């Protein structure tokens, strides 16, 4: 959780081809979700560090914003019908951790399972806590 909140900084770099972040299995899973969503070009696992190769488009980076929801000092959980309202009318990615793995808010909404909201990527200005 601390490692993910740290990796936010490494992900929000600009004018950089690649940036390093602390290693953790949770970081690896979030990176898997990001690559499946096509937000990073890739990443590499090197011992204590992970090297994220970032993706750009027309100069600007693909990742334009990261909003942290669940911090190590405060969990945030949502029922399906609260997640629907909170993610209403937004194309951003809200990362959710559930008993079924680290998935997207859209997978969580289709599954109707209760989840923990970790991060919001390219969510514009949409947050509640």
């Amino acid at each position: 959780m601390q490692r993910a909140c740290e990796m936010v900084v490494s992900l929000l770099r600009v004018d950089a081809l690649s940036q390093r972040c602390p290693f953790h299995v949770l970081n690896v899973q979030i990176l898997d979700l990001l690559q499946r969503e096509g937000l990073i070009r890739g990443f590499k696992v090197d011992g204590t560090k992970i090297d994220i190769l970032l993706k750009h488009y027309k100069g600007a980076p693909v990742i334009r914003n990261i909003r942290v929801v669940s911090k190590p000092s405060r969990d945030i959980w949502l029922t399906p019908h609260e997640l629907k309202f909170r993610t209403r009318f937004n194309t951003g990615l809200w990362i959710m951790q559930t008993s079924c793995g680290v998935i997207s808010h859209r997978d969580c909404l289709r599954m109707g399972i209760g989840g923990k909201m970790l991060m919001a990527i390219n969510n514009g200005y949409q947050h509640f806590c």
């Binding site: 690649s18 690896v28 990176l31 898997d32 690559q35 070009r41 890739g42 990443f43 590499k44 696992v45 992970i50 090297d51 994220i52 190769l53």
Partner: peptide, 10 residues
């Protein structure tokens, strides 16, 4: 091609 994988272990 070092930054090309799913889990990052190449």
């Amino acid at each position: 091609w070092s930054h090309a994988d799913g889990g990052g272990d190449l």
